[PDB]
Amino acid sequence: GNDLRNVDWNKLLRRAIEGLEEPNGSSLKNIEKYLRSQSDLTSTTNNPAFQQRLRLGAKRAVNNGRLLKDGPQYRVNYGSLDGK
Structure with missing residues (x-):
């Protein structure tokens, strides 16, 4: 993709x-x-860092409250995208 930015x-x-x-x-x-x-x-x-970026991002997302840790699944949390 011509767009090279961190989503x-x-x-x-x-x-x-x-x-x-x-x-x-x-x-x-x-x-x-x-x-x-x-x-x-x-x-x-296709970007190799795809899984890494998602795995790393997902970890922080939970720490921020972006996602919900419910067992082997994660639910979206709007409470606060930024967190806290």
Whole structure:
């Protein structure tokens, strides 16, 4: 992709959450699978740092309250994107 910028992992991560719609949220593996399937952003998905960026971003996202840790699945949390 001609666009070389760091997307808000939360956007792709959370967006992937709604995409799967997996009951009671979805796991990181399933979430990454959906994003990886995507074709428009294939640039990011194909980007090796795709899984790393999502894995690292997801970790912080939870620490910020962006996502919800519910077992092997994670649900989107609007309470506060920034966190706290």
